[PDB]
């Protein structure tokens, strides 16, 4: 019951019942902060590295690339260090010193990009080192990599089934890559065969999924719900297993995160506040009265600035 390295130590994260949200305790949270690296992305972080090894696109001598300096950047950084790979992360020069020092604390070869450029000054940059030796660099692409939802289908989803004794009725999750809701949803509906309700959450400000589903014009915008609302349909979001889409604004998300800390004693990130707020909305519909709703809390406070 000892792990060979920190990557193997992912998951078995806890389910806590909320007291000041939902109705007669129908809203239960999954705490994704309780992982190495301290985000939901630890899971994919391990398994995208495991997978590239297993199929042999990763080997002693290949060094990893991406431009995510978000939770997946930290995930990959921890796993790379645990497992002997050197990591390069692209990232505009516009970023925070503390993530620049979290990652340089993790042994990332950070590659400062352009504050005239953003995530193009990054995305396209990473590629160029992938280009300058495509037998050297290898880039994992969390937005389209199947090893992303696969891990969720084989860990996140089952842990929920088991913890709940197959009682779970609804699952609520914010969408970045889509891998959580996709893997979770496939586990419960396909491997177990229970016809639950899958709710994706997206910002009202950048509501590209609803817009797509309604055959409207896709119109992304800025928000503050860090970790979700990419502004496009990720290839890792299986639109097929998605029953419902709830939108949430930045203020409410932000306020719901403060409430979680101060009322529930739960150290929630901003995305976590988004997902709860939408679960609560469903939770207070007579239609989901007698229904056990599980919410993903992807990250922990302290990584944050919901503290104004």
């Amino acid at each position: 019951a000892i792990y060979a390295d920190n990557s193997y130590s992912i998951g078995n994260t806890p389910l806590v019942r909320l007291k000041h949200f939902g109705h007669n305790g129908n809203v239960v949270v999954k705490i994704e902060g309780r992982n190495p690296s301290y985000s939901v992305k630890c899971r994919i972080g391990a398994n995208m590295v495991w997978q590239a090894e297993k199929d042999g696109t990763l080997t002693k001598g290949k060094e990893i690339v991406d431009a995510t300096s978000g939770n997946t950047g930290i995930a990959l950084a921890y796993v790379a260090a645990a497992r002997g790979y050197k990591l390069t992360l692209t990232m505009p020069e516009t970023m925070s010193l503390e993530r620049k020092r979290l990652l340089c604390g993790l042994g990332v070869n950070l590659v400062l990009t352009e504050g005239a450029k953003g995530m193009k000054g990054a995305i396209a940059k990473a590629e160029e080192i992938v280009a300058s030796d495509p037998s050297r660099y290898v880039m994992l692409k969390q937005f389209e990599n199947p090893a992303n939802p696969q891990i969720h289908r084989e860990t996140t989803g089952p842990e929920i089934w088991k913890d709940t004794d197959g009682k779970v009725d609804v699952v609520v999750a914010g969408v970045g890559t889509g891998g959580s809701i996709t893997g979770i949803s496939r586990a419960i509906k396909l491997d177990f065969g229970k016809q639950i309700t899958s709710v994706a959450v997206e910002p009202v400000e950048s509501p590209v999924i609803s817009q797509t589903l309604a055959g409207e014009e896709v119109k992304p915008g800025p928000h503050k719900i860090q970790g979700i609302g990419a502004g496009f349909i990720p290839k890792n979001l299986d639109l097929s297993i998605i029953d419902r889409v709830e939108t949430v604004d930045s203020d409410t998300a932000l306020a719901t995160a403060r409430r979680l800390m101060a009322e529930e004693g739960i150290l929630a990130g901003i995305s976590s506040g988004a997902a709860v707020a939408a679960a609560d909305r469903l939770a207070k519909l007579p239609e989901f009265a007698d229904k056990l709703i599980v919410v993903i809390l992807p990250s922990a406070s302290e990584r944050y600035l919901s503290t104004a």
Binding site: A67, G118, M119, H223
Partner: peptide, 7 residues
């Protein structure tokens, strides 16, 4: 230069 793409 998509900010909310850095997940």
């Amino acid at each position: 230069d998509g900010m909310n793409l850095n997940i």
